[PDB]
Amino acid sequence: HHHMPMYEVQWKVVEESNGNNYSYIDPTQLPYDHKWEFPRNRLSFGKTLGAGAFGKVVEATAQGLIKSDAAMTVAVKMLKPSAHSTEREALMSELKVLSYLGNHENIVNLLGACTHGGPTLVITEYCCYGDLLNFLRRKRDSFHSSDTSPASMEDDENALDLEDLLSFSYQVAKGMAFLASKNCIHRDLAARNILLTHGRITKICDFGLARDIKNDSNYVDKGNARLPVKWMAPESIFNSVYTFESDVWSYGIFLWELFSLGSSPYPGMPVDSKFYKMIKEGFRMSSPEHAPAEMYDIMKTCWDADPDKRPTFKQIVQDIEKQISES
Numbered sequence: 046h047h048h049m050p051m052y053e054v055q056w057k058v059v060e061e062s063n064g065n066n067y068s069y070i071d072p073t074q075l076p077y078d079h080k081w082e083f084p085r086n087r088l089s090f091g092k093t094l095g096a097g098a099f100g101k102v103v104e105a106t107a108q109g110l111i112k113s114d115a116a117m118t119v120a121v122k123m124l125k126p127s128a129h130s131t132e133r134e135a136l137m138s139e140l141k142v143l144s145y146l147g148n149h150e151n152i153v154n155l156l157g158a159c160t161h162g163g164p165t166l167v168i169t170e171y172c173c174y175g176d177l178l179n180f181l182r183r184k185r186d187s188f189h190s191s192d193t194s195p196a197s198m199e200d201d202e203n204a205l206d207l208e209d210l211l212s213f214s215y216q217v218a219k220g221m222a223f224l225a226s227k228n229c230i231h232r233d234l235a236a237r238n239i240l241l242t243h244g245r246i247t248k249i250c251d252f253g254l255a256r257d258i259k260n261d262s263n264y265v266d267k268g269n270a271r272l273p274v275k276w277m278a279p280e281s282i283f284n285s286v287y288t289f290e291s292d293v294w295s296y297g298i299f300l301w302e303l304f305s306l307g308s309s310p311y312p313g314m315p316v317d318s319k320f321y322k323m324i325k326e327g328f329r330m331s332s333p334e335h336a337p338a339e340m341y342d343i344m345k346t347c348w349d350a351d352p353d354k355r356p357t358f359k360q361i362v363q364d365i366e367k368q369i370s371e372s
């Protein structure tokens with residue numbers, strides 16, 4: 046019998062509880078709208094896009110999904126036959142939360158599902174550049190400064206510049222604002238959980254069971270879970286408190302990764318009792334090299350120990366939209 050926090054960090058929808066508190070919704074209670082049902086036969090599977098112990102995501106072709114006589118590339122999340130009922134429930138619950146959330150430009154969107162007969166298939170948008178973290182890392186050496194000739198890079202047209210990084214930061218804040226408006230808390234926001242598509246649109250996601258979490262050292266064995274500690278707010282680490290404001294903390298850590306072009310957070314600071322002490326005492330990362338001062342300012346406010354002093358995603362969107370206008 047699996048403890049699911051060992052295998053993924055589940056997003057949560059919250060509902061108003063007593064007084065000013067929120068409580069988690071049990072996602073198995075959410076409805077699955079059968080308008081999403083899509084014939085299993087009209088799918089043709091290609092390469093695997095990610096896999097963990099019990100789940101995988103694989104690229105596929107779907108016949109007639111969006112237009113009656115047209116095919117389109119999609120990504121399909123599904124479980125391996127060795128999965129347990131606890132994973133099969135988690136995947137249906139993920140489908141129910143997707144059916145509840147609706148559609149947004151900056152999330153990986155639900156396109157359809159196969160829920161009768163064999164395994165649950167969750168059909169979502171395919172993003173051809175893959176995860177943003179790997180993209181930033183392979184694009185790292187070709188990042189180009191403002192007033193520099195295009196002739197110095199080979200693929201200057203495919204290179205990375207500050208305009209891209211500000212754009213990615215803006216689109217992720219917009220996706221997170223959407224999530225928060227549906228009372229959704231992601232709980233595992235990070236560049237590894239953001240995809241990049243045609244036109245360089247970023248889409249938030251979570252590989253979840255399709256990630257080999259035991260071999261991703263960004264997840265630390267803490268209690269009986271595997272937790273992305275370096276991305277988490279202190280209240281989540283120490284009191285297991287997850288709110289819209291803890292997502293903002295993670296967004297600040299994402300910004301640091303983004304403007305460091307995929308560097309790993311808190312270098313020279315392995316997760317141990319020393320790490321936890323320094324975070325409590327107010328240690329915070331310095332500005333990434335390519336981060337403009339105003340983006341580093343957002344980062345610092347994202348990391349306020351007092352959750353009420355952190356920006357909301359709605360405010361962050363306003364801030365970054367203005368920074369983009371002014372340049």
Ligand SMILES: FC(F)(F)c1ccc(CNc2ccc(Cc3c[nH]c4ncc(Cl)cc34)cn2)cn1
Nearest residue numbers: 094102120122152170171172175249250251252
């Ligand atoms: F809305 C959000 F909160 F952002 C959200 C959306 C979806 C999910 C979980 N659903 C999924 C499903 C598949 C994937 C992986 C994936 C897809 N399209 C892709 N295109 C390319 C590649 Cl290489 C990987 C993928 C990630 N998350 C979690 N959170």
